[PDB]
mmCIF file of C-alpha atoms in Angstrom:
data_model
loop_
_atom_site.group_PDB
_atom_site.id
_atom_site.type_symbol
_atom_site.label_atom_id
_atom_site.label_comp_id
_atom_site.label_asym_id
_atom_site.label_seq_id
_atom_site.Cartn_x
_atom_site.Cartn_y
_atom_site.Cartn_z
ATOM 1 C CA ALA A 1 26.252 31.990 49.383
ATOM 2 C CA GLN A 2 25.377 32.436 53.017
ATOM 3 C CA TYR A 3 24.750 28.428 53.630
ATOM 4 C CA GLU A 4 26.896 26.746 51.388
ATOM 5 C CA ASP A 5 27.031 22.884 51.262
ATOM 6 C CA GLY A 6 30.027 21.733 53.164
ATOM 7 C CA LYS A 7 29.590 24.572 55.450
ATOM 8 C CA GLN A 8 26.546 24.446 57.710
ATOM 9 C CA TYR A 9 25.574 21.398 56.235
ATOM 10 C CA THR A 10 26.499 18.420 54.080
ATOM 11 C CA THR A 11 24.470 16.601 51.310
ATOM 12 C CA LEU A 12 23.871 13.016 51.274
ATOM 13 C CA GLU A 13 25.417 11.186 48.437
ATOM 14 C CA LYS A 14 22.876 8.619 48.916
ATOM 15 C CA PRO A 15 19.474 10.363 49.618
ATOM 16 C CA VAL A 16 16.919 8.582 51.611
ATOM 17 C CA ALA A 17 13.422 8.529 50.170
ATOM 18 C CA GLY A 18 10.369 9.147 52.371
ATOM 19 C CA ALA A 19 12.615 9.989 55.788
ATOM 20 C CA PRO A 20 11.085 11.566 58.502
ATOM 21 C CA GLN A 21 11.176 15.618 57.618
ATOM 22 C CA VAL A 22 13.594 16.560 60.708
ATOM 23 C CA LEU A 23 15.201 13.521 61.987
ATOM 24 C CA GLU A 24 17.671 13.574 65.098
ATOM 25 C CA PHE A 25 19.954 10.681 66.497
ATOM 26 C CA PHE A 26 21.375 10.795 69.913
ATOM 27 C CA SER A 27 22.598 8.545 72.648
ATOM 28 C CA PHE A 28 22.695 8.990 76.354
ATOM 29 C CA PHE A 29 26.351 7.849 76.464
ATOM 30 C CA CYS A 30 26.955 10.873 73.897
ATOM 31 C CA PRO A 31 28.566 13.709 75.831
ATOM 32 C CA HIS A 32 27.713 16.499 73.203
ATOM 33 C CA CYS A 33 24.398 15.045 73.267
ATOM 34 C CA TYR A 34 24.298 15.928 76.836
ATOM 35 C CA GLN A 35 25.314 19.258 76.129
ATOM 36 C CA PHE A 36 22.795 19.407 73.111
ATOM 37 C CA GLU A 37 20.022 18.318 75.473
ATOM 38 C CA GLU A 38 20.126 20.281 78.703
ATOM 39 C CA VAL A 39 22.473 23.048 78.012
ATOM 40 C CA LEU A 40 21.541 24.079 74.504
ATOM 41 C CA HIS A 41 18.201 22.622 74.178
ATOM 42 C CA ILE A 42 18.588 22.155 70.348
ATOM 43 C CA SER A 43 15.729 19.931 69.718
ATOM 44 C CA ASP A 44 13.361 22.654 71.326
ATOM 45 C CA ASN A 45 14.806 25.715 69.619
ATOM 46 C CA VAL A 46 14.698 23.957 66.220
ATOM 47 C CA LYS A 47 10.996 23.449 66.828
ATOM 48 C CA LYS A 48 10.446 26.858 67.805
ATOM 49 C CA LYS A 49 11.678 27.843 64.356
ATOM 50 C CA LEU A 50 10.321 25.367 62.215
ATOM 51 C CA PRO A 51 7.243 26.038 59.944
ATOM 52 C CA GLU A 52 4.591 23.966 61.443
ATOM 53 C CA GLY A 53 3.103 20.853 59.639
ATOM 54 C CA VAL A 54 6.713 19.997 60.052
ATOM 55 C CA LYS A 55 7.068 17.039 62.529
ATOM 56 C CA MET A 56 10.087 16.157 64.400
ATOM 57 C CA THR A 57 11.606 12.709 64.981
ATOM 58 C CA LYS A 58 14.321 11.747 67.616
ATOM 59 C CA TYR A 59 15.955 8.376 67.678
ATOM 60 C CA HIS A 60 18.359 6.759 70.017
ATOM 61 C CA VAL A 61 21.375 4.674 68.447
ATOM 62 C CA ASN A 62 23.036 1.466 69.313
ATOM 63 C CA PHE A 63 26.837 2.016 68.722
ATOM 64 C CA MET A 64 27.643 3.412 72.184
ATOM 65 C CA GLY A 65 27.736 1.860 75.376
ATOM 66 C CA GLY A 66 27.355 -1.720 74.089
ATOM 67 C CA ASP A 67 24.751 -3.965 76.005
ATOM 68 C CA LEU A 68 23.573 -0.965 77.660
ATOM 69 C CA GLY A 69 23.521 1.155 74.527
ATOM 70 C CA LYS A 70 21.180 -1.314 73.263
ATOM 71 C CA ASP A 71 18.968 -1.633 76.346
ATOM 72 C CA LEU A 72 18.615 2.285 76.121
ATOM 73 C CA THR A 73 17.378 2.276 72.548
ATOM 74 C CA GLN A 74 14.585 -0.119 73.545
ATOM 75 C CA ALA A 75 14.060 2.082 76.705
ATOM 76 C CA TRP A 76 13.777 5.282 74.196
ATOM 77 C CA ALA A 77 11.141 3.100 72.155
ATOM 78 C CA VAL A 78 9.209 2.669 75.489
ATOM 79 C CA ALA A 79 9.350 6.389 76.103
ATOM 80 C CA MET A 80 7.951 7.073 72.561
ATOM 81 C CA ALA A 81 5.252 4.385 72.731
ATOM 82 C CA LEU A 82 4.275 5.574 76.027
ATOM 83 C CA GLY A 83 4.630 9.502 75.129
ATOM 84 C CA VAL A 84 7.115 9.880 78.040
ATOM 85 C CA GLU A 85 10.047 11.579 76.219
ATOM 86 C CA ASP A 86 10.030 14.536 78.199
ATOM 87 C CA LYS A 87 9.883 12.881 81.734
ATOM 88 C CA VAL A 88 12.714 10.492 81.176
ATOM 89 C CA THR A 89 15.224 12.382 79.028
ATOM 90 C CA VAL A 90 16.889 14.180 81.555
ATOM 91 C CA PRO A 91 17.021 11.683 84.498
ATOM 92 C CA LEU A 92 18.371 9.246 81.653
ATOM 93 C CA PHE A 93 21.153 11.514 80.805
ATOM 94 C CA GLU A 94 21.987 12.470 84.181
ATOM 95 C CA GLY A 95 21.927 8.751 85.234
ATOM 96 C CA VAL A 96 24.254 7.539 82.485
ATOM 97 C CA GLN A 97 26.674 10.611 82.484
ATOM 98 C CA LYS A 98 26.343 12.679 85.615
ATOM 99 C CA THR A 99 25.559 10.447 88.583
ATOM 100 C CA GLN A 100 26.411 7.059 86.884
ATOM 101 C CA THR A 101 23.697 5.188 88.395
ATOM 102 C CA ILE A 102 22.387 3.790 85.290
ATOM 103 C CA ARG A 103 24.567 0.431 84.991
ATOM 104 C CA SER A 104 21.764 -2.071 84.048
ATOM 105 C CA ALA A 105 18.592 -2.480 82.304
ATOM 106 C CA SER A 106 16.935 -2.340 85.943
ATOM 107 C CA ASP A 107 18.313 0.727 87.021
ATOM 108 C CA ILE A 108 16.957 2.243 83.567
ATOM 109 C CA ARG A 109 13.667 0.889 84.726
ATOM 110 C CA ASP A 110 14.070 2.845 87.952
ATOM 111 C CA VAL A 111 14.252 6.256 86.219
ATOM 112 C CA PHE A 112 10.780 5.478 84.432
ATOM 113 C CA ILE A 113 9.453 4.279 87.694
ATOM 114 C CA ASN A 114 10.343 7.109 89.585
ATOM 115 C CA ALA A 115 9.210 9.307 86.697
ATOM 116 C CA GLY A 116 5.728 7.993 87.625
ATOM 117 C CA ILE A 117 5.456 5.324 84.544
ATOM 118 C CA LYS A 118 3.917 2.265 86.371
ATOM 119 C CA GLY A 119 5.894 -1.014 86.797
ATOM 120 C CA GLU A 120 3.439 -3.235 84.887
ATOM 121 C CA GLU A 121 2.607 -0.552 82.180
ATOM 122 C CA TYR A 122 6.809 -0.210 81.752
ATOM 123 C CA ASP A 123 7.241 -4.110 81.615
ATOM 124 C CA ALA A 124 4.543 -4.468 79.187
ATOM 125 C CA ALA A 125 5.629 -2.020 76.873
ATOM 126 C CA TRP A 126 9.172 -3.040 77.238
ATOM 127 C CA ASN A 127 8.025 -6.306 75.783
ATOM 128 C CA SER A 128 5.453 -5.649 73.434
ATOM 129 C CA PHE A 129 6.146 -6.080 69.571
ATOM 130 C CA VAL A 130 4.924 -2.127 69.168
ATOM 131 C CA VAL A 131 8.302 -1.330 70.869
ATOM 132 C CA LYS A 132 9.965 -4.086 69.195
ATOM 133 C CA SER A 133 9.175 -2.275 65.529
ATOM 134 C CA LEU A 134 9.770 0.865 67.379
ATOM 135 C CA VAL A 135 13.285 -0.270 67.886
ATOM 136 C CA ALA A 136 13.414 -1.544 64.092
ATOM 137 C CA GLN A 137 12.291 1.750 62.995
ATOM 138 C CA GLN A 138 15.137 3.598 65.116
ATOM 139 C CA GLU A 139 17.749 1.093 63.699
ATOM 140 C CA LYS A 140 16.477 1.573 60.118
ATOM 141 C CA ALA A 141 16.644 5.134 59.951
ATOM 142 C CA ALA A 142 20.152 5.193 61.352
ATOM 143 C CA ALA A 143 21.042 2.386 58.981
ATOM 144 C CA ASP A 144 19.802 4.306 56.198
ATOM 145 C CA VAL A 145 21.816 7.448 56.648
ATOM 146 C CA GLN A 146 25.453 5.749 57.077
ATOM 147 C CA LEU A 147 25.502 6.991 60.652
ATOM 148 C CA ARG A 148 28.628 6.322 62.609
ATOM 149 C CA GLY A 149 28.374 9.598 64.825
ATOM 150 C CA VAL A 150 25.877 11.635 67.033
ATOM 151 C CA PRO A 151 24.592 14.029 67.850
ATOM 152 C CA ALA A 152 23.389 14.021 64.065
ATOM 153 C CA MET A 153 20.449 15.902 62.338
ATOM 154 C CA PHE A 154 19.161 15.047 58.840
ATOM 155 C CA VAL A 155 16.564 17.234 56.968
ATOM 156 C CA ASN A 156 14.244 15.416 54.302
ATOM 157 C CA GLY A 157 16.659 12.439 54.029
ATOM 158 C CA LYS A 158 18.884 14.860 51.775
ATOM 159 C CA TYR A 159 20.903 17.229 54.362
ATOM 160 C CA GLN A 160 23.066 16.980 57.421
ATOM 161 C CA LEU A 161 23.761 19.388 59.804
ATOM 162 C CA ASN A 162 27.491 20.275 60.195
ATOM 163 C CA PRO A 163 27.731 22.016 63.675
ATOM 164 C CA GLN A 164 31.502 22.080 63.513
ATOM 165 C CA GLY A 165 31.125 24.724 60.628
ATOM 166 C CA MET A 166 29.104 27.372 62.845
ATOM 167 C CA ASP A 167 30.736 29.570 65.750
ATOM 168 C CA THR A 168 31.149 28.251 69.367
ATOM 169 C CA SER A 169 32.058 30.863 71.582
ATOM 170 C CA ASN A 170 28.547 32.081 72.470
ATOM 171 C CA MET A 171 26.239 29.348 73.039
ATOM 172 C CA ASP A 172 23.089 31.164 72.462
ATOM 173 C CA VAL A 173 24.147 32.096 69.087
ATOM 174 C CA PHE A 174 25.516 28.554 68.288
ATOM 175 C CA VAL A 175 21.840 27.275 68.736
ATOM 176 C CA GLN A 176 20.092 30.084 66.660
ATOM 177 C CA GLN A 177 22.798 29.381 63.740
ATOM 178 C CA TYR A 178 22.016 25.967 63.992
ATOM 179 C CA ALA A 179 18.267 26.288 64.162
ATOM 180 C CA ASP A 180 18.140 28.652 61.097
ATOM 181 C CA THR A 181 20.062 26.442 59.252
ATOM 182 C CA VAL A 182 17.301 23.632 59.796
ATOM 183 C CA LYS A 183 14.736 26.018 58.841
ATOM 184 C CA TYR A 184 16.537 26.917 55.705
ATOM 185 C CA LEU A 185 17.282 23.467 54.830
ATOM 186 C CA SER A 186 13.642 22.837 55.632
ATOM 187 C CA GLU A 187 12.449 25.309 52.818
ATOM 188 C CA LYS A 188 14.848 24.005 50.279
#
């Protein structure tokens, strides 16, 4: 075929019932995720081609950056609960990887404060049970899909994107192929 198992995607030996339709995993410590987010805009470009009635879910993962890694997963939960993903994603990536000014939970908080979220509102979200289960959700989803590496994308708990199996000398073309694959798997 043109899209073959093992080529642009793999198939899960152990499918995951009831999974989010399009599910993406990343980490602010993950250099390819950095590339994926502000150089390639993968998340974006996928949406632009998904049929609609399709929702997209992005979760953070724990297994990079130890203690900070976990702090970041809670912070991403706060971001989701507050609906401020698009105001913190870039400063968080650049704070961890570019300037390296994120070294503690408090520094993560500064990014939110600077992005305009209020202290009391941040601290309350942080400490809230809704954010605890939203952490639990992120972990569960990662747990369900054998996850050892990021970036990672899964479609309908059955298919996993395989970006290594796509051309990379043109970035624009890599993205389009990636998004079209997601759209194919979607209709499967």
